[PDB]
Design an enzyme around this catalytic site. Sequence first.
Site, mmCIF file in Angstrom:
data_model
loop_
_atom_site.group_PDB
_atom_site.id
_atom_site.type_symbol
_atom_site.label_atom_id
_atom_site.label_comp_id
_atom_site.label_asym_id
_atom_site.label_seq_id
_atom_site.Cartn_x
_atom_site.Cartn_y
_atom_site.Cartn_z
ATOM 1 N N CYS A 223 1.167 -1.171 -0.576
ATOM 2 C CA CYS A 223 0.252 -0.345 -0.005
ATOM 3 C C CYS A 223 0.843 1.215 -0.189
ATOM 4 C CB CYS A 223 -0.890 -0.085 1.114
ATOM 5 S SG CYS A 223 -0.357 0.181 3.063
ATOM 6 N N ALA A 225 2.278 3.367 2.096
ATOM 7 C CA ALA A 225 3.721 3.383 2.856
ATOM 8 C C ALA A 225 4.182 2.168 3.370
ATOM 9 C CB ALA A 225 3.049 4.151 4.042
ATOM 10 N N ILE A 227 2.513 -0.404 5.617
ATOM 11 C CA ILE A 227 2.641 0.011 7.253
ATOM 12 C C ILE A 227 1.251 -0.254 7.842
ATOM 13 C CG2 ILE A 227 4.906 0.270 7.511
ATOM 14 C CD1 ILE A 227 4.084 2.537 8.588
ATOM 15 N N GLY A 228 0.252 0.306 7.112
ATOM 16 C CA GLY A 228 -0.783 0.632 8.280
ATOM 17 C C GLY A 228 -2.113 -0.642 7.742
#
Length: 288
Positions: A223, A225, A227-228
């Site tokens: 996605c 970044a 990470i989320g």
Amino acid sequence: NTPREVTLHFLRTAGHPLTRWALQRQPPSPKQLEEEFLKIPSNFVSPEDLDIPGHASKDRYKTILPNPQSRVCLGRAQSQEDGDYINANYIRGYDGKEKVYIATQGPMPNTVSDFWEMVWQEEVSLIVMLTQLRECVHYWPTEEETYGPFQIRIQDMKECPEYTVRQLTIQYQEERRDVKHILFSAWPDHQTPESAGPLLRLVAEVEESPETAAHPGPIVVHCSAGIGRTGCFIATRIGCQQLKARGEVDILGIVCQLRLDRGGMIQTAEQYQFLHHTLALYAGQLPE
């Protein structure tokens, strides 16, 4: 004990086992989940912890960096490119199993070739892309394109209610491999999906994927970044795996292990609560 020893110790030992019953019928309260989430250390790496000159041009975000311990290093077996850098980490799966996933950011225009080099080197056959409509380069071709030494072709494109499945091939010299690509849209950054059902169908789509290798490569999950949404997707799959195999899930423990693998996995308390919601729904699908 330094801040890093404190962080590592929390992440290696924190846990909150929830039976299938407690998850469905008596979960931790929204207040308790908010405070629990806030206590989880980020395990972000400082720029001083990476000595990789020029890496910044290959990062979408200056503060979101791959932990050096689990960093994917590009060996350049197939290319002549300088250095070994991609913003991507190996991620452990169910029960600590190594290299089940690679979490990475969506490629930038200057890192598309790096991304395909990674897919070749790691013998990736499945990519999970998490996005929303208004957003993220189109790093796969309409028909056929070459990226560095790799020729990529689209063999098929199938729209499901909640995601698009593409069948691709990647070829280097004489060798051509299948890669399944799943694009799940309707997942805004720093937010949750619209409901859990489509996410659980994405997880099922992943499970059903053909696994013909003797030593399966990591599943690439990306996605913006890395990470989320990546952390939410991976945590949901591992959560489902625990619930099915043991009739319980330790969601705190799961998120802690993901942060050992890549700093900052699962960004918001809302996302963390949504993981509880999602897994409560999956629990009811499970046989008596």
